[PDB]
Each structure stands twice: as C-alpha cells, then as structure tokens.
Amino acid sequence: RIAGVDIPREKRVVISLTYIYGIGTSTAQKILEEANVSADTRVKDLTDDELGRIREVVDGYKVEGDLRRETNLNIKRLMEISSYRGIRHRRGLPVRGQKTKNNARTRKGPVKT
C-alpha cells in the first residue's frame, strides 16, 4: 500500500504505481529512479525496505485526493467566473471547441434520438 492505495501485488512495481492517482508511467519510472527501487521487481516480491523508499518518493509528488481536489477547484473557478470554458462545463458540452453538430458524445452522453 502506497499513498493510501494498494497497488496490484502481481504486477511489476513500475506498472503497479500507475494505479495511484496523479501517477503515470512517466512519473512511475521517475519515482522508482529516485527511490532507487528496481522497476523489474514485482510488488509481491518487493522487499519491505524498498516499499518504504517508494512511499517516501510518492509522498513528495502530489497524489490521490490532493491532486483530485485541485483539479475540481480549477473547474469550479471557471464555472464561478462564468468563463466560456466554464459555461461549457455547466452545459456539459465540448469545452475545448470540438464541433457539436456531430460526435461530442463523450461530453453529451448517450444518444437521446
């Protein structure tokens, strides 16, 4: 368990770390590099001391709720300031200027024919 999240034991640590929010493959490589913990060794086979070292590095990066909270706050601010992007967030329509005549399903949700 690292950063309040239990990464899969079976998977290699490098991939396992990606499961933590705010950690991607790039960061997962970097956090292992700083920890000096090999990517190859699997989480189940990871030594206890190694696990602690990983945790220290992961703690240094913003992860889980702290990053989640920040992201939400930015979206909230846009809605608060009544920015065009914010308005589109409120509408649930493509915010970054993707055409809405066709497609736009992920933002708009399922087809209501």
Binding site: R77, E80, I81, S83, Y84
Partner: protein
Amino acid sequence: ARSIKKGPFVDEHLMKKVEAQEGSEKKQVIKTWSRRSTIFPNFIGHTFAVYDGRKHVPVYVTEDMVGHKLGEFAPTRTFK
C-alpha cells in the same frame, strides 16, 4: 502573445483607457471592441462593455478573471 517570451497581449487603446481610470477614485464603464485583449491585474475593479458582435455586454473584472481574455466572458452565440 501566447508564448511566455512575448508579454501578455493587450490592445493599446483598451490599456490606455484603463490607465486613465486607475488614477480616478471612481471607475467608469468602458466600451471596448477588444475581445482579444487579456485581463490584466490592473483591470481588476474595472467594468468593460465587451462587444458580443451585436451589442456590448457588461463585464466586471475580478481577481479570478485575471489571465482570461475579456472576450471569453462575453457570449457571441445564443442557444435556447
């Protein structure tokens, strides 16, 4: 412009109008066609009537709105 090396883009005519208002104790409504001009920190507390293409829509700058173009806040299209 967008690039960091270039300073934040603001139209001179809009900027100069704000500059005069800075000195004044009480700010006045500004008519601006400059949708493209960025909202500067100085702009805070100033009301700008940004053109939506058919009419000028009132916009009041706040701290949060800084770093966003004046044009963003005004809506050019109407739906329902």
